[PDB]
Amino acid sequence: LLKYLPIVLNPDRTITRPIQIPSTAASPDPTSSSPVLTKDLALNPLHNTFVRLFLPRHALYNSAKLPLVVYFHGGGFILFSAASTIFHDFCCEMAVHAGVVIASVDYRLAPEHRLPAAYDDAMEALQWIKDSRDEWLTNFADFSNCFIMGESAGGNIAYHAGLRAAAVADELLPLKIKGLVLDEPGFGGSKRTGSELRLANDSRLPTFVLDLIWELSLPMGADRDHEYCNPTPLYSFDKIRSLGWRVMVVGCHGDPMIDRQMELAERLEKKGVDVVAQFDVGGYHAVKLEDPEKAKQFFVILKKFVV
Q1: CA distances from residue 89 to 36, 37, 166, 290, 291 in whole angstroms, order as listed
Q2: Who's near 100: CB < 8 A, 6+ residues apart?
Q3: Residues classed as catalytic
Q4: ∠55-50-20 over CA atoms, to 5°?
Q5: Domain count across the chain
Q6: Is 188 within any annotated ligand binding site?
Q7: Is 76 annotated as a binding residue?
Q8: Host domain of residue 68
Q9: Distance separating alpha carbons of residues 245 and 177, to the nearest angstrom
Q10: What is the CA radius of gyration of the chain?
Q11: Which positions bind paraoxon?
């Protein structure tokens, strides 16, 4: 198991995180070397949640405002942070190569805070952005052009945040959401799918490791057909349709979660939502976080989508 998640299971239903996940300090000052300026802002001290802003260096050498991306990291709901190096680095590259201001949310983790905790923090992050008078937000970010995005579990979160935000859209103004970006959103269910069975001995996401994730994440008692797990009523798509939101879903064939990711893109389309789907052959789960080349190909498509 330390072979697939950097955690210990203890005989009282809790976990221990014995392996440091490397993180990167914010770098808010423009005399720093960095092509991207970062700073952390306290969100809710009771939840110990915070937001990391990424401001691309090129925003400073003009006076136009960039689309604002609200980003949620991946990690099975149970690990990582807005400041973890791999998500920090991905978000710096996205700011530069997609031309975006990024608000990356450090949401509460499971099992200590089982779902719906992190959807709750997502909504506070939106209510808090709307209300914000932060200088980087106010001088450099286009509130009219906002996208909700997440990788993996963060794509799960981004999707539920998106549904909830659709309901209260009038309440967010000056914030105007134009779309959702779901990067291999993390999804499940009680019956195995074709990819789940085909890929069952995956070398990153095997069957047991994902069973484990949903066990730690889902409310106590729940099965994998819980609505937070398995998205596919959908009266909710009518509201998303009506507001004119585009949804990008992306994944690859070498991800066990593929059939559910693709199945959700089908359901969104089938219901009249403007869906930009991008499903590749091969690769594996989170290849974009390791492969600078595959990330770059994705920024070309996201840059497109964002304008």
Answers
A1: 10, 12, 30, 10, 12
A2: 56, 66, 67, 68, 69, 94, 147, 306
A3: 152, 255, 285
A4: 95
A5: 1
A6: no
A7: yes
A8: 1-307
A9: 7
A10: 18
A11: 75-76, 152-153
